[PDB]
Amino acid sequence: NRKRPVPKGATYGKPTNQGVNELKYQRSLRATAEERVGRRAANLRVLNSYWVNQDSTYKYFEVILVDPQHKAIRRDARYNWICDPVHKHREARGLTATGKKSRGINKGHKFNNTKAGRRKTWKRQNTLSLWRYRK
Amino acid sequence: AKQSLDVSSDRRKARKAYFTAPSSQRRVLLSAPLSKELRAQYGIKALPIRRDDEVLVVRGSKKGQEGKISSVYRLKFAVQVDKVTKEKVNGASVPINLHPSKLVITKLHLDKDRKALIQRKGGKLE
Amino acid sequence: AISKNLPILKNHFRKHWQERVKVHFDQAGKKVSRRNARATRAAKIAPRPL
Amino acid sequence: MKKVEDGNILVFQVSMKANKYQIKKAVKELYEVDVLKVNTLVRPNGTKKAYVRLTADYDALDIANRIGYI
Amino acid sequence: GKGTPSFGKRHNKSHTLCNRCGRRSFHVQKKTCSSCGYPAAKTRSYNWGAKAKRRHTTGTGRMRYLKHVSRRFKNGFQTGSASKASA
Amino acid sequence: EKAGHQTSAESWGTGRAVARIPRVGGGGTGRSGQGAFGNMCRGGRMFAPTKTWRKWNVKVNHNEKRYATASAIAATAVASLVLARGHRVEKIPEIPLVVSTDLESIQKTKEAVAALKAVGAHSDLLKVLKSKKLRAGKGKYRNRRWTQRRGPLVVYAEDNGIVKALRNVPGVETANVASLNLLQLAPGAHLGRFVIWTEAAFTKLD
Amino acid sequence: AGVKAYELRTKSKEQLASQLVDLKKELAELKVQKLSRPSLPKIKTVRKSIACVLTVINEQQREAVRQLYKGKKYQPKDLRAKKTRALRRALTKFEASQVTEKQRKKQIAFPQRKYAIKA
Amino acid sequence: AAQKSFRIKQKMAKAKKQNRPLPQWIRLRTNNTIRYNAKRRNWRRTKMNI
RNA sequence: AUAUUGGCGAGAGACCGAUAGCGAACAAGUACAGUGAUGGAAAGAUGAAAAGAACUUUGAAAAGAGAGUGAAAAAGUACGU
RNA sequence: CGUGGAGGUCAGUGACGAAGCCUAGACCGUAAGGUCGGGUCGAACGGCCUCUAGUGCAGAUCUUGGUGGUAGUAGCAAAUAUUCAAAUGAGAACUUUGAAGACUGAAGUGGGGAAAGGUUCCACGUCAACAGCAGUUGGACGUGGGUUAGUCGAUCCUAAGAGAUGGGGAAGCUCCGUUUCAAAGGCCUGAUUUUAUGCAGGCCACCAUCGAAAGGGAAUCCGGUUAAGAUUCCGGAACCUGG
RNA sequence: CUAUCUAGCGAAACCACAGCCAAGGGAACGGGCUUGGCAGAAUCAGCGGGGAAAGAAGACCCUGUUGAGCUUGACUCUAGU
RNA sequence: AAACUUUCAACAACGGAUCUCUUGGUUCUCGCAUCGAUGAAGAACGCAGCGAAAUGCGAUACGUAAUGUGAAUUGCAGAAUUCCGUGAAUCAUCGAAUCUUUGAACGCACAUUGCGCCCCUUGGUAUUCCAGGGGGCAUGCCUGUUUGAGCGUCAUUU
Ligand SMILES: [Zn+2]
């Protein structure tokens, strides 16, 4: 779990917010996995990652990264999409396959809240649209 | 009426633009109309005034005075005439400042580049 | 507070709504854009239909 | 000036970035003179002044007004 | 004692000149800067401080380099030199 | 939306013999101490600051807008109204004033002006010319410096040079019958524009 | 007035070398004079001649290097283009242009057709 | 301080060269507004704060 | 096709008119305060043109009185009303 | 009734004087107000039909500015104390010189420094402001000058402690840890005299760094000199360190 | 040594408007109102009766569906264990 | 009767309202996509004949090169003839350079203008010591080169 990093369990506020210990990170371990090796090989681009083992204390992932300035990738079609500046640190914006998951991105009724992007969709439904000739 | 989406009928920007115009556009703004004599000679209405031009004053208290331009005092929008001056109480001379829109040019200081400009303007030729 | 014989309104403005007002002053502008785009697409679309 | 007239010393404003070696060398070459020692200080206006005493084979006053001041 | 006579004891410095920003805001013992945050590689700033931000953002200095980038773009990051006509 | 509020001011609360308006803190400058935010305060926010989301455009039922423009067209044929609106048609043959469709084809201001003049409009055209005035107010510096009366309104059915020909004679405006504007037929909301119709336009009317 | 870039571009590495040292001596003297004369403007004209030479000496050397690197794969970073940090990292046109082999075939057999409606 | 760092003395030197009246001929310049050196400082009126 | 109180280039307003309008129309995020984070002003207008008052006289001087400039000094760098 | 701005209209008023302001002058209106004369002024402005609001003040211990009575008033009384003359000056209780009278009394009102200031130091000129009387005086104003090192400090060392690095936590800003669960070096010199050089010997190493102008620590003294520097310059006489 | 008087220098507090009483009535203790006593320029040093004098929107008290510091087998939770 | 107080007026003070101005603000709209290890943004100290600031610049220091324009700049001084010209300019443009001390900031440090290491080169007899000039030594990561480690492990010489 994520222990609420507050000083002595002290929360300063309403009781609904007074929790410290059954609290869970909205992103997955696998994402924490991706994000750290990505910071370490910042010259690489994170393509994907997969589980490989765990014990009581650790989950273990192998992360797959690709070198955007190596000419085998830049000359390859198929992959040179990843050389584009828009895929800089995709795993830090949750665009790797783990990211898209946790982020609630899928078609259908079960993803209304969340999937044009949660925050963006909220913003839409809370915007007062005013025309020149008011309706 | 303007028609262009690229000109501004705006009083503010017009004033800013005049008042902060750099020496080179200021040259063009300080242009003067040729005399009728000179206008028939090169088929052309006006030119950017220059130093060593001969000149008639056609407006204001110095009307009728004539002379050579001594300097184009760009940073002042003004022109001074080797011969048109104020004599102070202490006998000292001091140039009068004249605007070339209030002059009329009577002898151009011609010059290879001067001629070329007249030609460029649709002026006579020779 | 509730008074007089009036309908019960539900005007949802308890929320900082002023930070998200969208007044479409660009109504006329966007239209001129939409058309100028339609124009030039058709242009480079040779005699194709859009 | 008195230092020139009475102490066999040439006085110079000199690069802030200089040093007693670098100064002695330049003096030794721009003026074709030999040098006894250089003292320096950083003047309070932020420039460095260098007292260069010449060896006794040279008269600073002579070479002062060769350079062309007095 | 807590005022005037105790003020006379004020003669040591908590902060000096910061190498990075040049305010007298560099805390001697903490060896860090209360304005700019040096020596952290990041620069200190906060969104609760619009004014402080405005006091130090880009364009409040010389833009030695940046100030020339858009003209450069305007001409397509030209290489080479200008030709000369004749007349 | 920020004006008046770019300060960390606070009330001093009562007990200091001094109003409880928020005051700017710190010292060493004239402004520490001074009333802050708040509309009787020099430099504070205005009362009920103006918002862009004010309603600017007003809708009018299309049928009614039309009704208006209709009425305004009828009014241009009543001399007494056209006169009261200050158009100088005190001479002029008859009204509606109709003019051959050659007008639509004139190309040149001088000839357009000569044309209008002959058809009786010399006088109104003058009116405009002798009416240019420096605007009274302060809009004089908001891109509205001069003020003049309103000349005749020339309507046509096809544009073959009459529009550009007339676009520089002070006071005069041009209009296609196919369109036709209430703001032009009833200026200031006053009925009775001086209208000159080309034949073409006139029969297009129904 | 002083020197002119063009008159200097015709000279050897070593004449400009000496040109400078004389210009240096020049200003060297004027400074001695600047301080007993109540203003010395001649100096700004030599301060600049100095710049001009340095500029042109420097022009020469850069070309030199640029020449003995012509056609070579690795130029000094100095003399590479400059453009922008981003633009420098973008795919070459070749790289970008790259189309997979399966796509090549498709493009060759089913391109956008020109066409027009009426009959 | 007496034993003073070079950085401090540097700042001190600059701070001293700035300490002069307005050069009188500026007043003669065309369209000149500057009447006096308004940013002027004194050791007994305002400290340098290093 | 959508977003855009940032950046670059532009056209506008039934907006404000120097206690207003941005805090800043000015050498303004300045001067100044605070160990620090931060706080943060006041302040535009002689005249078309300096023609910014030669000269005389009183005074230690600043200045006054004359004279003079100017359409005006009931405009004198304390300056429009 | 009155105000900022907007559409329309009087082809409205105006440098032969707009607006504004002053006026126990005039006239209209129950009134909100309007109108006129005279004076002052200098560039724009108004009536009527409409439109529009950031539209009307006596107050809010209202905001900002400006001004009074208070009042030539309270005051300018701690720290023993001043006086005569001359000089200078437009001017002298207050400056300088001389004389007198006194005080601080070496636990100093003497002679140096540390923090702190930053040019206040010295010279020339010099009084509008400032020094709560004065001023010819000044730590003030203007213009200049001035700080000289192998040996005095920093610099080196380590102290409380601060803190990178293999790493381990943490969504993360970063937190922990400092020899720590780490493959963590570099000192001699032979070989080789293709060469000053790669190498053949080999020992020793739980080991970043910052942290003292009072701690630790290589080495300088006396005389002379300036308007202002001096264990720093001069003269003379030494010492330490590296080579 | 002050105060005092002089030359120079020169604040602040406070101020609805003001400043002679007796009685009356009156928000039940008036400088003003009502009826009477009376009533003469301009002032100086003192003084502490009065100006329910002046200094912080009353310290005490109560009200408010206003708090905070603190305590506890009040209510509802929580780091930890 | 003065003086004093109060009222009104004229002239003169004090103060900055009013009116008129406006290279500024504010709001709408349209077009565009460009920061940085090729060292950004930001900081410090400097640079002018005569500058404290603002603005601009970097020891090539209110700028050098180049291109256009075609005679200024201007407070004063001063040039220079270059004014039928590869050419004024406190001009515009800008494609070539310069770009101190720093800053993510990169040899180590940094209340220090503190302290190393390496290559080239120049002086002082010098491979080693000193001084001068030039060029270098951060970290994570990727692909590759080279040189290596482990009875992890294969095959072999015999
Ligand atoms: Zn800092």
SS3 content of chain A, % helix, strand, coil (to 5): 35, 15, 50
Are the CB atoms for F147 and F170 separated by under 8 Å?
Answer: no
Q: Whose CA is nearest the C1' atom of nucleotide J113?
A: H2
List of residues 6+ apart from B101 with CB closer than 8 A: B31, B32, B33
CA E41 vs CA A7, E18, E33: distances in Å: 27, 14, 12
CB–CB contact C25 A132 (8 Å): yes
Nearest chain H residue to D44 by CA distance is H13
Candidates A29, A31, A39; CA nearest to A97 is A31
H-run or E-run covering E25: strand E24-27
**CB burial string D17-56: b at 16+ within 10 A, e below:** ebeeeebbebbeeebebebeebebeeeeeeebebebbbee
**Taking all atoms of strand K, which protein residues have CB closer than 7 Å?**
A 3, 8-9, 15, 18-21; F 14-18, 20
How far is it, in rounded angstroms, from Cα E24 to Cα H50? Answer: 7
* Amino acid (one-letter) located at B62: K
Is G82 part of the contact surface with chain E (CB cutoff 8 Å)? Answer: yes
How far is it, in rounded angstroms, from Cα H3 to Cα H21? Answer: 30
Nucleotides of K under 7 A from a protein CB: 14, 55-58, 76-80
Is A86 part of the contact surface with chain G (CB cutoff 8 Å)? Answer: no
How far is it, in rounded angstroms, from Cα E18 to Cα E32? Answer: 8
Interstrand relation of E24-27 and E15-17 (parallel, antiparallel or unpaired): antiparallel
Strand partners, B120: none
How far is it, in rounded angstroms, from Cα C47 to Cα C37? Answer: 16
Q: Running DSSP on this structure, what letter comes out for residue F150?
A: -
H-run or E-run covering B116: helix B112-120
Nucleotides of L under 7 A from a protein CB: 20-24, 26-31, 34-46, 48-53, 56-58, 60-61, 63-99, 102-105, 110-113, 131-133, 140-143
Flag whether E21 is marked binding.
Answer: yes
How far is it, in rounded angstroms, from Cα A53 to Cα A33? Answer: 13
Alpha-carbon dihedral E46, E50, E51, E52, rounded to 10 degrees: 20
Strand partners, D14: D48
User: Which chains touch D (3+ CB pairs under 8 A)?
Assistant: G, H
CA H19 vs CA F199, G43, H12, H13: distances in Å: 85, 27, 11, 10
- CA of G40, C1' of L122: distance in angstroms: 37
| Residues on F contacting C at a C-beta cutoff of 8 Å | 52-53
CB–CB contact G84 E69 (8 Å): yes
How far is it, in rounded angstroms, from Cα B73 to Cα B30? Answer: 10
By three-state DSSP, how is residue B6 classified?
Answer: coil
CB–CB contact F58 A130 (8 Å): no
A78-83 CB contacts, 8 Å cutoff, 24+ apart: A78/G100, A80/G91, A80/G95, A80/G96, A80/G98, A82/A45, A82/A47, A83/A45, A83/G91, A83/G95
H-run or E-run covering E10: none
CA B66 vs CA B54, B81, E61: distances in Å: 7, 8, 52
CB–CB contact A128 C27 (8 Å): no
List of residues 6+ apart from A114 with CB closer than 8 A: A103, A104, A105, A121
Spacing, Cα E42 to ligand 1 middle (Å):
11
Are the CB atoms for D8 and D60 separated by under 8 Å?
Answer: yes
CA A35 vs CA A1, A4, A31, A32, F23: distances in Å: 18, 21, 6, 5, 48
- CA of H46, C1' of J94: distance in angstroms: 30
How far is it, in rounded angstroms, from Cα G80 to Cα G61? Answer: 15
CA B105 to chain centre: 8
How far is it, in rounded angstroms, from Cα A81 to Cα G98? Answer: 11
Flag whether E18 is marked binding.
Answer: yes
The structure tokens listed for D30 are 């721009």
Nearest chain F residue to B13 by CA distance is F143
By three-state DSSP, how is residue F194 classified?
Answer: coil
Could you tell me where the beta strands, DSSP code E, fall in C1-50?
21-23
* Amino acid (one-letter) located at F30: G
- CA of G108, C1' of L8: distance in angstroms: 107
Flag whether E36 is marked binding.
Answer: yes
* Amino acid (one-letter) located at A99: G
Q: Running DSSP on this structure, what letter comes out for residue F13?
A: -
List of residues 6+ apart from F165 with CB closer than 8 A: F106, F107, F108, F109, F111, F112
The string of DSSP letters for B12-77 reads HHHHHHHHT--HHHHHHHTEEEBPHHHHHHHT--EEE--TT-EEEE-SSTTTT-EEEEEEEETTTT
Spacing, Cα E29 to ligand 1 middle (Å):
14
Q: Running DSSP on this structure, what letter comes out for residue F101?
A: T
* Amino acid (one-letter) located at F175: A
Are the CB atoms for B109 and B52 separated by under 8 Å?
Answer: yes
Is A85 part of the contact surface with chain G (CB cutoff 8 Å)? Answer: yes
Nucleotide closest to residue F14 (CA–C1'): K57
By three-state DSSP, how is residue A36 classified?
Answer: helix
By three-state DSSP, how is residue F69 classified?
Answer: helix
Residue pointed to by tokens 């895929």 = A87
Q: Whose CA is nearest the C1' atom of nucleotide K56?
A: F15
Nearest chain G residue to A74 by CA distance is G95
Kindly list the residues from chain G whose CB atom is less than 8 angstroms away from the CB atom of residue A78.
100
Angle CA A5–A10–A12, to nearest 5:
110
The structure tokens listed for B6 are 């690229």
Angle CA F162–F165–F170, to nearest 5:
115
Alpha-carbon dihedral A90, A91, A95, A98, rounded to 10 degrees: 160
* Amino acid (one-letter) located at H35: R
- Ramachandran sector of residue B121 (left: φ over 0; alpha: ψ -120 to 50; beta: rest): alpha
| CB-based burial label for H20 (10 Å; 0-12, 13-18, 19+) | exposed
- CA of C41, C1' of J59: distance in angstroms: 70
B69 CB neighbour count, 10 Å cutoff? 23
A105 CB neighbour count, 10 Å cutoff? 16
How far is it, in rounded angstroms, from Cα A67 to Cα B68? Answer: 75
Q: How many CB pairs under 8 A join E and H?
A: 7
The structure tokens listed for G84 are 């922008």
Is H27 part of the contact surface with chain D (CB cutoff 8 Å)? Answer: no
Candidates F151, F171, F161; CA nearest to F102 is F161
By three-state DSSP, how is residue A89 classified?
Answer: coil
- Would you give the end-to-end CA distance of chain E in angstroms? 86
By three-state DSSP, how is residue H23 classified?
Answer: coil
CB–CB contact G81 E77 (8 Å): yes
Instruction: Give the gyration radius of chain H's Cα atoms.
Output: 15
Kindly list the residues from chain C whose CB atom is less than 8 angstroms away from the CB atom of residue F53.
21, 23
How far is it, in rounded angstroms, from Cα A37 to Cα B7? Answer: 56
Which of C12, C17, C20, C27 to mutate to test binding with chain A, by most A CBs within 10 Å of its CB? C20
The structure tokens listed for D26 are 């330049």
Closest to G99 (Cβ–Cβ): which among A69, A74, A77?
Answer: A77
How far is it, in rounded angstroms, from Cα B105 to Cα B119? Answer: 18
Candidates B50, B35, B34; CA nearest to B121 is B34
* Sign of the alpha-carbon torsion through C32, C33, C37, C38: negative
3-state secondary structure chain G: CCCCHHHHHCCCHHHHHHHHHHHHHHHHHHHHHHCCCCCCCHHHHHHHHHHHHHHHHHHHHHHHHHHCCCCCCCCCHHHCCCCCHHHHHCCCHHHHHCCCHHHHHHHHHCCCCCCCCCC
Does residue F96 have a cis peptide bond before it, meaning omega lies within 30 degrees of 0? Answer: yes
- Ramachandran sector of residue F17 (left: φ over 0; alpha: ψ -120 to 50; beta: rest): left
Spacing, Cα B85 to ligand 1 middle (Å):
60
CA A75 vs CA A45, A78, C8, D60: distances in Å: 16, 9, 67, 74
Angle CA E30–E31–E36, to nearest 5:
105
Spacing, Cα E16 to ligand 1 middle (Å):
10
Angle CA E50–E54–E59, to nearest 5:
150
- CA of H35, C1' of J91: distance in angstroms: 33
Is C50 part of the contact surface with chain G (CB cutoff 8 Å)? Answer: no
Is E65 part of the contact surface with chain G (CB cutoff 8 Å)? Answer: no
Spacing, Cα E32 to ligand 1 middle (Å):
8
Q: Running DSSP on this structure, what letter comes out for residue B101?
A: G
Candidates D17, D18, D50, D49; CA nearest to D35 is D50
Half-sphere exposure of B110 (CA within 13 A, CB side): 10
H-run or E-run covering E83: none
How far is it, in rounded angstroms, from Cα A87 to Cα F145? Answer: 55
Are the CB atoms for F24 and F10 separated by under 8 Å?
Answer: no
Is G114 part of the contact surface with chain C (CB cutoff 8 Å)? Answer: yes
How far is it, in rounded angstroms, from Cα A90 to Cα A96? Answer: 6
Candidates B18, E23, C26, B73; CA nearest to A130 is C26
F199 CB neighbour count, 10 Å cutoff? 16
Q: How many CB pairs under 8 A join A and F?
A: 10
CA F41 to chain centre: 36
Does residue B33 have a cis peptide bond before it, meaning omega lies within 30 degrees of 0? Answer: no
Are the CB atoms for G23 and G50 separated by under 8 Å?
Answer: yes
Nucleotide closest to residue A8 (CA–C1'): K79
The structure tokens listed for F5 are 């509020």
SS3 content of chain F, % helix, strand, coil (to 5): 30, 10, 55
F152 CB neighbour count, 10 Å cutoff? 28
List of residues 6+ apart from G54 with CB closer than 8 A: G20
Candidates B26, B32, B30; CA nearest to B46 is B32
What method was applied to determine this entry?
cryo-EM
Is A126 part of the contact surface with chain C (CB cutoff 8 Å)? Answer: yes
